Design a protein around this ligand. Structure first.
Ligand SMILES: *[C@@H]1O[C@H](CO)[C@@H](O[C@@H]2O[C@H](CO)[C@@H](O)[C@H](O)[C@H]2NC(C)=O)[C@H](O)[C@H]1NC(C)=O
Ligand SMILES: *[C@@H]1O[C@H](CO)[C@@H](O[C@@H]2O[C@H](CO)[C@@H](O)[C@H](O)[C@H]2NC(C)=O)[C@H](O)[C@H]1NC(C)=O
Ligand SMILES: *[C@@H]1O[C@H](CO)[C@@H](O[C@@H]2O[C@H](CO)[C@@H](O)[C@H](O)[C@H]2NC(C)=O)[C@H](O)[C@H]1NC(C)=O
Ligand code: NAG
Ligand code: NAG
Ligand code: NAG
Ligand code: NAG
Lengths: 536, 219, 532
């Protein structure tokens, strides 16, 4: 049978979460994303980007620290409306925000369907130079999803190049290196992809996205989750083949399924966390969901970076004849430099840079970008499952150092309806424990002109302040990680909750947030919560 | 000489009546912000009907507003219930046709190299764009969302000797990147067609026949 | 966007549904029930009970006539030796059909030794001698089979070998030759699970699900297959003693969206019923056992079911390749699947004589390209927020005093009954009532509970629905008029055609087929006027 959805140990409704601090304004914001650098919290929004000092103050209302202003020129707001887009869509929506170095800031905005980037100082939030072009680095439409990541001084981005958003591409520039892009109008590389996240690991950059499956074309248009690697030291192909194109781009399907007689695959990838160490294994967690025109369901799978790096060393898959089953290419026919290994690595020392790759290998990787095997998840089964709810899990944040002794693993999940799910992943079959479920949306302070958009735009965990910042389209909420205050004087509940961030203190006499290095003696039962002899 | 009796239908909307004693046949012109007059299309059409606009005495309604670093000019065709608006910006030009009823966007084209687009039988657009030092001007008229009728290409600064003598039909267009400058919104693909009477004039005048080869016309 | 599950207008918990009569006649292990000539028959282990439907007022119900047929010691010993469980080795009746108006036809497993015997209707005695029942009755009571008499001919679908590997569709008796599917192989049947057969016009239709041959990457798709009633087999060289009209087509029960989501596991299919002028059968579909639990009810017009088999066939242009439609120019002149003696077929006297090329074509191209489209191309009913899967389905095309209401009843694997008002001009369905009927008190045995519903039989004469469980048979009256009792508000809110408010007595009560008293019921909407 199918695993049943576990019951939340505790439930927190909007009635209780109506007291958490909310950013709001101090008009709409159209918040796009949130990231944390040191103690500063950056809120990327329409025509603006705010900063919040996390280490300062706890007032009921969050007040902005510094406010950067970047409005599109009138000469550009008009040239966007003339094209056909709505007035509401012809503004400067910040869709790229990365740290360039120790003091610079790299910010790109849609700028009324005309992407343009600009460098900013971190200490004074002021422009640092002229606006260079934003093509292939920032999307045109604020509704689209885009990825950007700085690695070894270079900028890796993935978005659409054209006004109509038809030519999606992965791009690289600004790294004192030549620019590279995927083959234009080549469905074998990317077929209407939807980029989600990119991570830096070892000598490769991994892009996680979903796209129309090329091998599963018998049924029709089906969306499959993919992971794609690109070497960090790639410098393009030769003058004749794959010039200004990737020479190490390979992709493989993500396997997030419940193994049985007939496996059930979750295909719609929603979010992917960065590389996080967990039980001595570099691992990334990813949330997958069922298609929009199917029964609602969501699953969280974890993937070991070693398994990811190992799936790109396997055999490739091809179509021997058009409209036929895909078969794994035998190794005896692959030329022997391995397609996808970075120049100057083991057994490839004879090739200085990618420019010296033989023509035949460039052609092979141009016509065979898809790997045969699928990336196996940890334990070959999803870590978490929800199938009896109407909402769809999207964002995911993980705390690999949660608890008093910093040896737990707590994963936070967002949803398209504003509900936060929290479960204690264990690291050797993992029993798992769905700790709590909570509605964080605050209609009193987030609704604008009687409109309710609950889609979570981002989640950022702040271990220093024991808080989790959840950003909505019109507001940002500071949700405490522990929520110990709700339990209060009910020791029976404080122990039965089995919450790592909480505990019981006889000195104070109440349930309260537990500091990582709190000399006060705490009582908790994370292993097994026995309420016998206490309550109610 | 010319008395421009004006008035205001709505906020920031003005009508310019062009009356000449010698002609003794007053005209009507539009003047306002293009963006505002491209959304209230239903409202403006009603007012025009209500002010006793001559049904067939005027064939085309001229519009030409002047704004900083911009040149919004166009003509609404009352007979076809359509409209053409042209916007010349500091770095790119926009040519858009919106059907007057229901404000339906039939097809919107745009180019980054066309500048100072003027409006002229049937009125047709003209524009000049120089890829290099030599200046090349081409006349065109877009009939359908996927088809462009580019009849004539005026060359200047000894362009004929510079390039035409070298090659001496579609290959020549591709070489000069006519397709690249033309960016078609609402459709990825684009097709080019030529009028039967199309001629290229730079003094040398040439006009290709049905076959790909291009013969000359006058010399 | 996906359609949300409608809310049940009325819910009856297990606590309330204990008064309803319960029949328990030891472990019964019922196989199926069926109503015939106003009399309910109970097919179960080594015993056939006949509850008297006429005594509806009687709260208690006792088997008037008990049929006894126990396996012989030799057969029981053989079953035990072969390795089957001692409990499984018993005479499980799995086929009960009416041979004629004065005869009864019964087949039982007979402890893994299929055998059939004719029984008299009135006296209920062994009217005739028995005989081997191989390929007519399954070996394991857990397995499902179909049997359907038509024009004195017995069409069956089950497994022939003890290992349950050789699934076959069969036809015996009636002074006609024996016909069967190609033994073993996968061209015609690849591990099927038979559900129901119906008789319509001149074509017998079998509904089942089987391993999809089109999906190389193992998925189970629902199929409908037709056979010619007058089929006489192939020539002496090709298809000798085999079917010459076996064709099958995919069932399309999906929610139109960006990507179609198909309900693949067919659960039950009702007999042919005349609804809204059109002849239609209703079928229940569920998601696979290793998928998110969800169920759907789709309806199929017999006209569309016939039309699909007149389209293009399926074929593999090359081995290990996608399936493509057979070109229309390459079909033999006598269209495979058409029965001899019909239109444009005077030349062929009987199915026995055909051209060998047609026979080879229909033996190598049994699957039709197009799929059977459902009425309105969308499921009539959907449940996606529960753990159980809808199984059995009963339909009443003569509901209400005016007999123009169509009420559909749906069973579940957990003993919960679903009732919705199917409206046929397309409109949203109306969930009328959901209720759990399993009476744990009277049905549980040795603290063991099996809520899996084994069958549902609607009886219009007593306005009741008999729901059979493995350990008991529960007589559920249609709806729950007695529940509401005297109050009229809730009765007008439930909008159940089977309940009405009496004008003379001033109390809500169940309706009757013909009654002089006036009726009060607002079907379109209930405003709860005069709320108490
Ligand atoms: C996704 O991962 C599952 C993990 O179970 C794979 O299921 C295995 O498939 C292989 C061959 O298909 C079998 O030999 C194993 O027995 C299966 N596992 C179990 C537990 O039964 C599944 O094939 C993978 N899907 C892919 C690679 O597309
Ligand atoms: C995290 O580490 C602490 C100690 O640093 C663990 O607490 C001890 O766990 C062991 C079991 O391995 C018990 O025998 C001790 O009594 C515990 N000491 C206490 C509670 O003071 C804790 O279990 C670890 N958490 C994990 C592994 O999840
Ligand atoms: C099952 O039925 C659905 C709906 O009847 C089919 O969806 C249609 O697909 C065609 C092209 O494949 C479209 O032109 C129609 O517009 C679709 N219908 C709707 C309502 O959108 C589906 O193709 C069918 N599948 C099979 C295998 O027969
Ligand atoms: C939350 O407040 C609303 C206010 O209308 C109330 O209806 C609801 O019952 C409350 N939920 C609780 C107290 O759990
Ligand atoms: C944090 O701040 C210090 C000083 O303000 C700075 O040196 C350091 O680089 C900052 N952290 C990061 C990751 O840049
Ligand atoms: C139905 O039963 C009644 C009485 O039990 C009997 O008289 C009648 O003949 C039966 N119907 C048929 C078709 O045999
Ligand atoms: C059945 O017929 C009666 C006769 O008047 C009518 O009132 C009723 O609406 C009909 N039922 C339906 C479902 O239309």
């Amino acid at each position: 049978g199918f695993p049943e959805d576990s019951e939340p140990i505790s439930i927190s409704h909007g009635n209780y979460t109506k007291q958490y601090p909310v950013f709001v304004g101090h008009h709409r914001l159209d918040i796009q994303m949130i990231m944390i650098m040191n103690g500063t919290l950056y809120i990327a929004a329409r025509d603006h980007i705010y900063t919040v000092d996390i280490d300062t103050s706890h007032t009921e209302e969050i007040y902005c620290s510094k406010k950067l202003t970047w409005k599109s020129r009138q000469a550009d707001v008009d040239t966007c409306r003339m094209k056909g887009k709505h007035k509401d869509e012809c503004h400067n929506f910040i869709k790229v925000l990365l740290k360039k170095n120790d003091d610079a800031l790299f910010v790109c905005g849609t700028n009324a369907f005309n992407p343009s980037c600009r460098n900013y100082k971190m200490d004074t939030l002021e422009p640092f130079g002229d606006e260079f072009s934003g093509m292939a680095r920032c999307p045109y439409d604020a509704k689209h999803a885009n990825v950007a990541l700085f690695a070894d001084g270079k900028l890796y981005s993935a978005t659409v190049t054209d006004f109509l958003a038809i030519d999606a591409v992965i791009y690289r520039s600004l790294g004192e290196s030549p620019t590279l892009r995927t083959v234009k109008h080549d469905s074998k590389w990317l077929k209407e992809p939807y980029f989600v996240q990119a991570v830096d690991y070892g000598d490769y950059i991994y892009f996680f996205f979903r796209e129309i499956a090329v091998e599963y074309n018998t049924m029709g248009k089906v969306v499959f989750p993919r992971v794609a690697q690109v070497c960090k030291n790639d410098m393009g192909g030769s003058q004749r083949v794959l010039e200004k194109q990737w020479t190490s781009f390979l992709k493989a399907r993500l396997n997030c399924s419940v193994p049985g007689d007939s496996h059930f695959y979750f295909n719609i990838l929603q979010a992917v966390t960065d590389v996080i160490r967990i039980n001595g294994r570099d691992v990334v967690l990813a949330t997958f969901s069922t298609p929009y025109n199917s029964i609602p369901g969501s699953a969280v799978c974890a993937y070991d970076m070693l398994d990811i790096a190992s799936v790109f060393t396997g055999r490739f898959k091809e179509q021997k004849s058009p409209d036929s089953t895909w078969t794994p290419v035998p190794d005896e026919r692959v030329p022997k430099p391995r397609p996808g290994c970075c120049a100057g690595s083991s057994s490839l020392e004879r090739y200085a840079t990618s420019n010296e790759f033989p023509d035949d290998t460039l052609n092979f990787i141009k016509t065979h970008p898809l790997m045969d095997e699928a990336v196996p998840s940890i334990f070959n089964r999803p870590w978490f499952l929800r199938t009896m709810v109407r909402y769809r899990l999207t964002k995911i944040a993980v705390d690999t150092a949660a608890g008093p002794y910093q040896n737990h693993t707590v994963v936070f999940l967002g949803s398209e309806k504003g509900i936060i799910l929290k479960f204690l992943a264990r690291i050797f079959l993992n029993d798992s424990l769905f700790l709590e479920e909570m509605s964080v949306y605050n209609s009193e302070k987030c609704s604008y002109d009687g409109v309710e958009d609950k889609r979570i735009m981002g989640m950022q965990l702040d271990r220093a302040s024991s808080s989790l910042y959840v950003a909505f389209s019109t507001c940002v909420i500071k949700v405490p990680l522990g929520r110990c205050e709700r339990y209060g004087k009910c020791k029976k509940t404080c122990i039965a909750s089995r919450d790592p961030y909480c505990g019981w203190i006889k000195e104070g006499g109440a349930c309260s947030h537990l500091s990582p290095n709190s000399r006060l003696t705490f009582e908790q039962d994370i292993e097994r919560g026995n309420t016998d002899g206490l309550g109610d | 000489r010319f008395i421009s009796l004006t008035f205001s239908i709505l906020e920031d909307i003005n009508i310019i009546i062009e009356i000449d004693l010698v002609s003794k046949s007053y005209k009507i012109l539009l003047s306002g912000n293009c963006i505002k007059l491209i959304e209230n299309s239903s409202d403006i059409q009603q007012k025009i009907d209500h002010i006793g606009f001559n049904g067939e005495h005027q064939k085309y309604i001229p519009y030409s507003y002047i704004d900083n670093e911009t040149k919004y000019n166009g003509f609404i065709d009352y007979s076809k219930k359509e409209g053409l608006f042209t916007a010349e910006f500091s770095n790119e030009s926009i040519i858009r046709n919106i059907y007057m009823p229901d404000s339906n966007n039939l097809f919107i084209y745009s180019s980054k190299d066309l500048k100072d687009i003027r409006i002229i039988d049937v009125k047709l657009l003209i524009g000049n764009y120089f890829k290099d030092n030599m200046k090349v001007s081409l006349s065109f008229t877009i009939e359908d969302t996927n088809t462009i009728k580019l009849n004539g290409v005026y060359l200047d600064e000894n362009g004929v000797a510079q390039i035409l003598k070298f090659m001496n039909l579609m290959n020549f267009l591709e070489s000069i990147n006519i397709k690249n400058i033309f960016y078609n919104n609402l459709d990825p693909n684009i097709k080019f067609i030529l009028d039967t009477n199309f001629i290229i004039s730079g003094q040398f005048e040439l006009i290709c026949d049905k076959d790909k080869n291009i013969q000359p016309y006058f010399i």
